[PDB]
Amino acid sequence: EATKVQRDISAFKKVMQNISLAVNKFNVDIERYVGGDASHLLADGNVLIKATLDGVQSLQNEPPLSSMEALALVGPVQDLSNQIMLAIQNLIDKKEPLVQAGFGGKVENNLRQQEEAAQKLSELVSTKVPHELADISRQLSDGIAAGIKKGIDAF
Ligand SMILES: CCCCCCCCCCCCCCCC(=O)O
């Protein structure tokens, strides 16, 4: 069936973040540990065990993830790109009824605004990505830009 309202997968993200923070607290402490009393390291370990077991409880009621829902978790940038590309094709698919409704020009206008806004966010992201990810990040934004252009060219 057609795309539905996005599944709330926040419980999964929360478990991941909780475990991530507990692991980080341990890494900060262990790397600075020289010798002597290690009670605080054992406490860090206990916090991590509890975060893990809390995850077992937190996710006990979650239905299985679909392919798309799993990607939303594992590869959120890829998920977003996929959903944007879907939006573009879905829009192009409705060109005829949109024109029959009198909205063809307005859609083209809106797409030109999407294009300009996307360009601006893409520029900003290019300044925040580490140098070794510059090309892969640009490839992703260029792909979206090309999609928006396809939309514009259809209206
Ligand atoms: C009413 C028409 C709506 C058409 C929606 C399809 C166009 C979606 C474009 C969203 C661009 C999101 C910005 C991405 C910025 C970036 O690449 O970093």
Curated annotation (Swiss-Prot):
PTM annotation, UniProt: Mannoprotein, glycosylated.
Subcellular location, record wording: Secreted, Cell wall
Reported effect, residue 122 to A: 2-fold increase in affinity for palmitic acid. Decreased binding affinity for palmitic acid
Chain residues that bind hexadecanoate: 122
Top-level taxonomic group: Eukaryota
Biotechnological and industrial applications of this entry: An enzyme-linked immunosorbent assay (ELISA) with antibodies against Mp1 protein as well as Mp1 antigen-based ELISA can be used to detect infections caused by P.marneffei (penicilliosis).
Similarity remark: Belongs to the cell wall mannoprotein 1 family.
Subunit structure: Monomer.
Function: Constitutive protein of the cell wall. Binds fatty acids and may thus serve as a fatty acid transporter between P.marneffei and host cells during infection. Abundant antigen target of host humoral immune response.
Record's protein name: Cell wall mannoprotein 1
Gene coding for it: MP1
Residues of the full protein shown: 192 to 346 of 462
